[PDB]
Design a protein that fits this description.
Chains A, B: fluorescent protein E115C/T118H
Structural class of chain A: mainly beta
CATH class of chain A: Mainly Beta
Helix content of chain A: under 10%
Oligomer: homodimer
PDB class: fluorescent protein
Keywords: fluorescent protein
Order of helices and strands of chain A: EEEHEEEEEEEE
Entry title: Crystal Structure of Full-Length Split GFP Mutant E115C Disulfide Dimer, P 1 21 1 Space Group
Strand order of the largest sheet of chain A: 1-2-3-11-10-7-8-9-4-5-6
Largest interface: A-B, 19 and 14 residues
Assembly: dimeric
Distance between the termini of chain A: 21 Å
CATH superfamily of chain A: Green fluorescent protein
Chain lengths: 220, 220
């Protein structure tokens, strides 16, 4: 449950996407250290150039690696679902634009932690910030609000992602999320505050993304 | 357990190896399709350059994805063990050289079929076809003979593997495996006829192997 998240864990990520009829596949790879909250991953677009901006995919592509202080270890639903893992469903609303519908399995296929995601995006404006590729290669820091569901013995989360546009404006992305266990902790109201860096591999010819995250828990 | 294989299934493999003291790790990723019997996978050595040739690891690294025709479905042991899974133990005798001892766990992990493997190779000649890396980046077509092991509630299999050598000569490798259920249809004597292509990913800078297989059952 948590003994798995001592030390460093190799991570494998697979995204299967479809936005307005445009299909694409992404394979991620790297390491996570939940004890310090660190994520280090390289993503690869295995279908050529993406039909959507890389930052719009950041939230969808391992909250189990968030750092919970010892006084909040009770409230770590994510880890305690391991190995068996959990389903993570999201509907992501982009203001004045399309929406993403996602469903993911975050499970321990045992040496690696694996996140496999189905993504379908609909009703995106072709000259909007998304399909028009007008979003900066950035990612601001957000709080992620977590509450519990006795009903599915899972959790729910609410947060808004602020995407930087080349204008200097902000593209808002409202996230609504459900996490339920794949098989048999439930937390008090608390939040995850996230940080993210986006970069490139200067020797990578395919459309890719290098990502670094530090997520720690708080609010209790 | 034919239900789980009606379509395409994502496959993730892990090989933990030690051949003549040389430790190494191989991650495998890709998908299978047992309705046509196709495997398309990519393997990565996360450990550095392999001490052994990639063809010597091909058999160790999902028969459950073999194609059984409608009239042979009563002999498909591998699929009947799903998703609970089976243990596959092998001993591989390389003619006039060392030997492989492999133990594997082939079981379902969410939507993934997972193959966790332990491999130990001993008594290899350093200037032989294996440690000396003399085997062509190749794989021949074989017949994998399967019989029932009623005492074991599973199946035994026996086959001969023909590795091409740079010589123009052949390196024989005698395979003996015992497949036992974790958590099954019983099979008359039949065989699996196999075909395999080995290739590279030009964008992958680590020691790797891209694999593609077509396996069909016959003999009844």
């Amino acid at each position: 449950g948590e003994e798995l998240f001592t030390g460093v864990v190799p991570i494998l990520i697979e995204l299967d996407g479809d936005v307005n009829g445009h299909k694409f596949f992404v394979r991620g790879e790297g390491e996570g250290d939940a004890t310090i909250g660190k994520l280090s991953l390289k993503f690869i677009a295995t279908t050529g150039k993406l039909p959507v901006p890389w930052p719009t995919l950041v939230t969808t592509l391992v909250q189990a690696f968030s750092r919970y202080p010892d006084h909040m270890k009770r409230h770590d639903f994510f880890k305690s679902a391991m190995p068996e893992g959990y389903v993570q469903e999201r509907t992501i609303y982009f203001k004045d634009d399309g929406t993403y519908k996602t469903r993911a399995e975050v499970k321990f296929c045992g040496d690696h932690l694996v996140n496999r995601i189905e993504l379908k995006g609909i009703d995106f404006k072709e000259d909007g910030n998304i399909l028009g590729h007008k979003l900066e290669y950035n990612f601001n820091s957000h709080k992620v609000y977590i509450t519990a569901d006795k009903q599915n013995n899972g959790i729910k989360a609410n947060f808004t992602i602020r995407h930087n546009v080349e204008d200097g404006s902000v593209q808002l992305a409202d996230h609504y999320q459900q996490n339920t266990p794949i098989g048999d902790d439930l937390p008090d109201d608390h939040y995850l505050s996230t940080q993210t860096i986006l970069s490139k591999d200067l020797n990578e010819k395919r459309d890719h993304m290098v990502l670094l995250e530090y997520v720690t828990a708080a609010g209790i």
